[PDB]
């Protein structure tokens, strides 16, 4: 997290900051994941 | 003390002198105040109470043997003779590190 950071042209030249209307939500596209719940074994009475 | 003498490496540093000299005269001449109490002193430097400037010193690191002779009065109780010797050193500070040089 402490390393110097910079962007290439592909994240600057080929893009930009779109203007967003309060009332037009643009939702973020995200990674694919799933959530499970399982029991762990307890060692000790 | 009726008489006081300092001996350095077997030799007299000064001729022995009466205790009164060391109690009354020496601090008159060399320090800020005369104690008026029976405190005996001797300086190796001229005119001070630190005074924020050395006015001489005796380098005892070269004295292999130092003795001081006291001729005591005849009405003393057995006990302590507390001897102090304020001296100089070099405080040295560098790159975050402290310490005192000999």
């Amino acid at each position: 997290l402490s390393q110097l950071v910079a962007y290439g042209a592909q994240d600057v030249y080929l893009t930009g900051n779109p203007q967003i209307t309060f009332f037009k939500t643009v939702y973020r596209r995200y990674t694919n994941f799933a959530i499970e719940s399982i029991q762990q074994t307890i060692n000790g009475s | 003390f009726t008489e006081v003498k300092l001996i350095i490496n077997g030799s007299d540093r000064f001729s022995g002198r009466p205790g009164a000299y060391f109690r009354l005269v020496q601090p008159y001449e060399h320090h800020v105040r005369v104690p008026s109490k029976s405190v005996y002193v001797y300086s190796f430097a001229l005119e001070d109470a630190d005074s924020r400037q050395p006015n001489g010193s005796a380098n005892f690191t070269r004295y292999d043997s130092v003795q001081l002779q006291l001729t005591l009065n005849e009405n003393l109780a057995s006990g302590r003779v507390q001897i102090y010797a304020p001296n100089f050193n070099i405080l040295r500070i560098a790159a975050g590190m402290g310490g005192l040089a000999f």
Binding site: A6, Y7, V12, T15, G16, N17, R28, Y30 | -
Partner: protein, 55 residues
């Protein structure tokens, strides 16, 4: 005999002076500031998508 090696070094050292230019090979890449709006957008965004990149 001696003049032979003298001329050999005479030409060889000029050859070396020609050769030496090849040694230093640094990479050049420049730095520039983000556009203000794009900079604000990047600073505002909360998720990074891809985790990290080394170049």
């Amino acid at each position: 005999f001696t003049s032979f090696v003298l001329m050999l070094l005479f030409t060889g050292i000029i050859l070396i002076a020609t050769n030496e230019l090849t040694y230093n090979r640094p990479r050049e890449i420049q730095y520039r500031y983000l556009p203000r709006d794009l900079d604000s957008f990047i600073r505002t965004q909360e998720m990074p998508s891809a985790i990290f990149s080394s170049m």
